[PDB]
């Protein structure tokens, strides 16, 4: 946690319905958006912190 | 019915998704209760159910 | 059985109630009293208080 990995994701088409297959988690909690509306709207870049 | 753990949140009014769009759609004016409990000891078998 | 808890099966039961104006058929175990007229009283008619 003190050395969390940051990955920049850009220049690709993002389908957010495969993360459920990727990981066994209950809730795909989001703050500024809704989990089910993530395929219509689109951003500049997205950062993944692990 | 029986669903996955990821699709429990789709059984709710105003929710969209694979299950809520092709299998079971709830009305937006819904007035009722939803009960969900784990059945790993009943609906799961070794090698796949 | 070896998958994570997010992919485990879940049994779901949805109980949908009907707030119609037809006579009620499913009513709870609350007992009914007698009818008093021409007097200021509280009344509970089929859940209408």
From Swiss-Prot, chain C:
Chain positions covered by the region annotation Disordered: 21-43
Domain of life: Viruses
Its biological purpose: Attaches the virion to the cell membrane by interacting with host receptor, initiating the infection. The major receptor is host ACE2. When S2/S2' has been cleaved, binding to the receptor triggers direct fusion at the cell membrane. When S2/S2' has not been cleaved, binding to the receptor results in internalization of the virus by endocytosis using host TFRC and GRM2 and leading to fusion of the virion membrane with the host endosomal membrane. Alternatively, may use NRP1/NRP2 and integrin as entry receptors.
Record note on quaternary structure: Binds to host ACE2. RBD also interacts with the N-linked glycan on 'Asn-90' of ACE2. Cleavage of S generates a polybasic C-terminal sequence on S1 that binds to host Neuropilin-1 (NRP1) and Neuropilin-2 (NRP2) receptors. Interacts with host integrin alpha-5/beta-1 (ITGA5:ITGB1) and with ACE2 in complex with integrin alpha-5/beta-1 (ITGA5:ITGB1). May interact via cytoplasmic c-terminus with M protein. May interact (via N-terminus) with host bilirubin and biliverdin, thereby preventing antibody binding to the SARS-CoV-2 spike NTD via an allosteric mechanism.
Name by which UniProt lists this protein: Spike protein S1
Organism: Severe acute respiratory syndrome coronavirus 2 (2019-nCoV)
């Amino acid at each position: 946690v003190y050395a969390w990995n940051r990955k920049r994701i850009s220049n690709c088409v993002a389908d957010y319905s495969v993360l459920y297959n990727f990981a066994p988690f209950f809730a795909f909690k989001c703050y500024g958006v809704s989990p089910t509306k993530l395929n219509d709207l689109c951003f500049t870049n997205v950062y993944a912190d692990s | 019915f029986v669903i996955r753990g990821n699709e429990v949140s789709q059984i709710a009014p105003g929710q969209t998704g694979n299950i809520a769009d092709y299998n079971y759609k709830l009305p937006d004016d819904f007035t009722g209760c939803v009960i969900a409990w784990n059945s790993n000891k009943l609906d799961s078998k070794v090698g796949g159910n | 059985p070896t998958y994570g808890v997010g992919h485990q099966p879940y049994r779901v039961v949805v109980l949908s109630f009907e707030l119609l104006h037809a006579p009620a058929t499913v009513c709870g175990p609350k007992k009914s009293t007698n009818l008093v007229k021409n007097k200021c009283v509280n009344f509970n008619f089929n859940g209408l208080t």
